[PDB]
Symmetry: C3
Subunit: 133 residues, 3 copies
């Protein structure tokens, strides 16, 4: 049998809808795309792409920790941008969170994001013990 666990953290925003913040399948954690929402206001943080990146990655950490993962167990990220010219600024914030054994990554500019956001970040991570060889 496969072990599925529904992952939720009240520290990470959860706008209404038929989705879960993350789903754990054995040791592989599939995270929903994260916007830079302030959990208190339920709105995007002010300040644009830098602030939204930072907020999204802080929010992500609550989901990773709830599942028994962490930033240094993230396998792959996808960065959806409203504007490819924000990449440099987004990547500088990304380096605040990802310091070693860096994830695989894809990045592109989309047509639009929900909530008129400047980005959205999706990730896959590993839970439990990880030997990096």
């Amino acid at each position: 049998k496969t072990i599925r666990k529904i992952i939720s953290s009240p520290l990470c925003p959860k706008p209404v809808g038929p989705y879960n913040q993350a789903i754990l399948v054995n040791h592989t954690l599939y995270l929903s795309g994260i916007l830079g929402i302030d959990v208190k206001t339920e709105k995007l943080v002010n300040g644009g792409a830098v602030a939204e990146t930072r907020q999204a990655l802080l929010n992500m950490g609550h989901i990773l920790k709830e599942a028994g993962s962490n930033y240094n167990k993230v396998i792959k990220t996808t960065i959806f941008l409203q504007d490819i010219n924000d990449f440099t600024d987004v990547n500088e914030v990304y380096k605040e969170f990802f310091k070693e054994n860096y994830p695989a990554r894809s990045t592109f500019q989309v047509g639009k994001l929900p909530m008129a956001a400047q980005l959205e970040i999706e990730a896959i991570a590993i839970t439990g013990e990880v030997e990096t060889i």
Copy 2:
């Protein structure tokens, strides 16, 4: 070894390029993106985003059943929209299919979809027995 199975249903629109409808690896099913095509016509259903979402999710059910999965064993979906303003409507259709243990999800507006479609959905699901906690 890893067991791979090619998944094919004649009830889901057949591939119009060098791809399979889905690939099963052990118990993880990787679905290709699905459009709201009626296999009886080789065309999108009429009526725009709502109709197309419903037909895409019916199509998905054929693939899931062929592989030994189902909607309640879907792990992650990605919804590609031609217009972000269809999101609420697409979500209402989505809830006709996904009732519990909801998948992780990401949603965004693309530049263009194949067939000038309004909606495309890709998914990852689990086959066989699933114990949910």
Copy 3:
């Protein structure tokens, strides 16, 4: 324990920033999105979508082989296009590399790609022995 391997092929452009070419988790290989970059010039190959598809898929083969995979062990690809009207030409190049047991796939047009590329291709693959039933 989950075994993670950091994949780095010297026959492909070395990561400049906080990402890796691919991450191997047990026998599942998560590839970064690949652009059609010439490893020597660190610039896209000239000639547009056809040339960039060929170079991207040549780069993918370097990364797959470094990890112990190959094209016939790719599970799923995603093709990010600058122009959906390139699909027919991209598919003709894709068929140079993928011959049998075709991956699942999604293809769509984005707003913009890094480096003003015409194409980016991401993949998931299997390492080690694979039995196709």
